[PDB]
Design a protein around this ligand. Structure first.
Ligand SMILES: Fc1ccc([C@@H]2CCNC[C@H]2COc2ccc3c(c2)OCO3)cc1
Ligand code: NA
Ligand code: NA
Length: 497
């Protein structure tokens, strides 16, 4: 079985997964809409009571399963809980990242395409007024995606967009086919430093932006000036718990897969805490210093609220590209921005596709080449639904991350810390640990963490159709059936040998 070569490589690979577009787009918009600097109060709380405890647990389950040659939850859940229902629940940890894969790598290709378009100058050049600058780029994105101009729910992606998606798929395979250390880990050691440099250069250049409408200081001001009156709102405390779950990539089964390549007695306590901390520093320092400040700098603090409400997606793919066409040397600026997002996405996507590669290797005994190619085949095939059927993406993302990760997140806790045994679980986490987990976390993991998660489930249920969503529901239901069949074939192949 493969292992991580260096402790640094392991941390950078784990961080590479956590850090993505959300760090530079989603988190800054979440903060502005939920109290500005005051949003850090429930965010740090959520980080301590939910994020950190669960990540350690997934790291432990990963290393525990990896010692016995299993990197995926269908096999690991069965080791923690000798039951048939444990194998079936495990299918979800194979299903969720695979559902995400169908739209994630595609959106990832958008950044690459946009980076190429910016570098070679194939971008709009307005013209005055805000809508006179934004609309030419609003149409640039819609022509790239193929946003329906009629009543039909049909997307018609450009040939360029489709080809870049092909190229993006290829790049992912290239890294994945070289394995864990010589592939994922090797790339982690290049991308993360490259990422940091790209970010810092943008942070510096954004801080020098000055327009008749405002400055970069106005951006950092609007974003971080606290509004504690919003702390009364339970929705803010829910968004904080949700964002942390989103930020670290919990409940995807990815961390478990990666942790399985950590050797039996190697540290996971300090290693996990370090990687988690990098992701957070990236969000508050790098992520919060670029997108929102640059936007507020150009349009003024008067439109700062309007900008935040327009969402993280509009900000990154419409607003900032418009601003770049109006700034000095913006054409190279746009390339760096989208190059930055691409590498951030590429280090997450190769991790999310590893779980399927691991299953095909560990349980069906396929070669790494075959495992990678068939995984790529499944993801590439599935993506045509996301590329051509409008709002299919929303439907996949809703089941997969809206409730799926949290439900699966709660499933991990109960299976590992309650069914497998809290005492056995606790010894598993701290074993080989450079530092020991604070004893107070024993109660947090066992009661506080699953309670917070269970609350998130209940609010989802109480809170929550055009016929085309049934197409997406049809297929993702089919995937779960197909993966169930593979798990079935796995346990049958094992009885023979
Ligand atoms: F809707 C969303 C929820 C959570 C997130 C996470 C946020 C932190 N960084 C990791 C993100 C998930 O990344 C993935 C996961 C599986 C994948 C993948 C990429 O490509 C193929 O299979 C992104 C989007
Ligand atoms: Na993140
Ligand atoms: Na990434």
């Amino acid at each position: 079985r493969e292992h991580w070569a260096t402790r640094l490589g392991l941390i950078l690979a784990m961080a590479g997964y956590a850090v993505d577009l959300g760090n530079f787009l989603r988190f800054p918009v979440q903060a502005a809409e939920n109290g500005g600097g005051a949003f850090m109060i429930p965010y740090i709380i959520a980080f301590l009571l939910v994020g950190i405890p669960l990540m350690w647990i997934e790291w432990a389950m990963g290393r525990y399963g990896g010692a016995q040659g299993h990197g995926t939850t269908p096999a690991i859940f069965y080791l923690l809980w000798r039951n048939r229902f444990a194998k079936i629940l495990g299918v979800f940890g194979l299903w969720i990242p695979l559902v995400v894969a169908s739209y994630y790598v595609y959106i990832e290709s958008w950044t690459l395409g946009f980076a190429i378009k910016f570098l070679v100058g194939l971008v709009p050049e307005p013209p005055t007024d805000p809508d006179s600058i934004l609309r030419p780029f609003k149409e640039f994105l819609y022509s790239y995606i193929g946003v329906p101009k009629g009543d039909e729910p049909i997307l018609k992606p450009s040939l360029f967009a489709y080809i870049v998606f092909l190229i993006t798929m290829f790049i992912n395979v290239s890294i994945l086919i070289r394995g864990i250390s010589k592939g994922i880990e090797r790339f982690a050691k290049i991308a993360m430093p490259t990422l940091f440099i790209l970010a810092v250069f943008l942070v510096i250049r954004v801080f020098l932006l000055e327009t008749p409408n405002g400055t970069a200081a106005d951006g950092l001001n609007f974003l971080w000036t606290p509004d504690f009156e919003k702390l009364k709102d339970p929705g803010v405390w829910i968004a904080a718990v949700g964002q942390i779950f989103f930020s670290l990539g919990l409940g995807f089964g990815v961390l478990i897969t990666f942790a399985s390549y950590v050797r039996k007695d190697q540290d996971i306590v300090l290693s996990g805490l370090t990687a988690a901390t990098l992701n957070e520093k990236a969000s508050v320092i790098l992520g919060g210093s670029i997108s929102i400040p640059a936007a507020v700098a150009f349009f003024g603090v008067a439109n700062a609220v309007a900008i935040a409400k327009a969402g993280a997606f509009n900000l990154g793919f419409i607003t900032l590209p418009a601003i770049f066409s109006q700034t000095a040397g913006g054409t190279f600026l746009g390339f760096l921005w989208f190059f930055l997002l691409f590498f951030a996405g590429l280090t997450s996507s190769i991790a999310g596709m590893q779980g399927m590669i691991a299953f095909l290797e560990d349980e069906l005994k396929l070669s790494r080449k075959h495992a990678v190619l068939w995984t790529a085949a499944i993801v590439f095939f599935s993506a045509h639904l996301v590329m051509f059927l409008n709002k299919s993406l929303d439907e996949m993302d809703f089941w997969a991350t809206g409730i799926g990760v949290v439900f699966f997140g709660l499933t991990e806790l109960i299976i590992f810390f309650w069914i497998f045994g809290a005492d056995k679980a606790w010894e598993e986490i701290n074993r080989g640990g450079i530092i020991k987990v604070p004893r107070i976390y024993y109660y947090v993991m066992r009661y506080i963490t699953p309670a917070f998660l269970a609350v998130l489930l209940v609010v989802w249920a109480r809170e929550y159709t055009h016929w085309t969503v049934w197409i997406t529901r049809f297929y993702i239901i089919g995937l779960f059936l197909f993966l169930t069949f593979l798990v079935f074939l796995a346990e049958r192949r094992r009885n023979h040998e």
